């Protein structure tokens, strides 16, 4: 939408409805260049590990986004509010946005 126009806003909040809670979290990320844009084959041959620690795989130049911890979404106050009042909980839906590159 242009150089001088922001493509999103800071949405960090928590709304408690009767039987739902919606948690929003905005963070600032930095992404470097990994591997000099190369795909590299990695293994344990140079490591000289034990038979239990042997591996073979690949390192990509990509990074990934991870929000698979509860404190990425709940403040400690929100967590206390949830656990002191609810017999159970589960996730229903999510929205992901990437903005202001």
């Amino acid at each position: 939408d242009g150089v001088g126009n922001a493509s999103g806003n800071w949405h960090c909040d928590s709304t408690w409805l009767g039987d739902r809670v919606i948690t929003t979290s905005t963070r600032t990320w930095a992404l470097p260049t990994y591997n000099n844009h190369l795909y590299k084959q990695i293994s344990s041959a140079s490591t000289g590990a034990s038979n239990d620690n042997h591996y073979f795989g690949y390192s990509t130049p990509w990074g990934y986004f991870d929000f698979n911890r509860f404190h990425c979404h709940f403040s400690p106050r929100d967590w206390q509010r949830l656990i002191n009042n609810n017999w159970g909980f589960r996730p229903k839906r999510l929205n992901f946005k990437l903005f202001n590159i």
Partner: protein, 106 residues
């Protein structure tokens, strides 16, 4: 006009409900006597009373980050459970519980 013991001061509070047993006279004399009755049939009454109060709540809207202080039961092996009966059937309240646990900015 807030009561000094605590609570809600009401100009028209919940009214007093007053109850009594209607007197039942005992056997009157055969001849008339204008002296007021003093001999009554001894009686009492029993029953059930229900009170239902609707209360309006004012929910917290706090943006505080760290967890709040809450009223909690103590987790520990104890001879009794708080706010329960004992082996004799006597209900007891171990401590007085106030209301001010959540916080808000001044």
């Amino acid at each position: 006009p807030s009561p000094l013991m605590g609570g809600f001061g009401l100009k028209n509070p919940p009214p007093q409900i007053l109850i009594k047993n209607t007197p039942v006279p005992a056997n009157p004399p055969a001849e008339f006597s204008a002296t007021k009755f003093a001999s009554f049939i001894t009686q009492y009454s029993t029953g059930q009373v229900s009170v239902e109060i609707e209360w309006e709540l004012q929910k917290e809207n706090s943006k505080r980050w760290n967890p709040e202080v809450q009223y909690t039961s103590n987790y520990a092996k104890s001879a009794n459970v708080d706010f329960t009966v004992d082996n004799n059937g006597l209900y007891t309240e171990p401590r007085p519980i106030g209301t001010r646990y959540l916080t808000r900015p001044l």
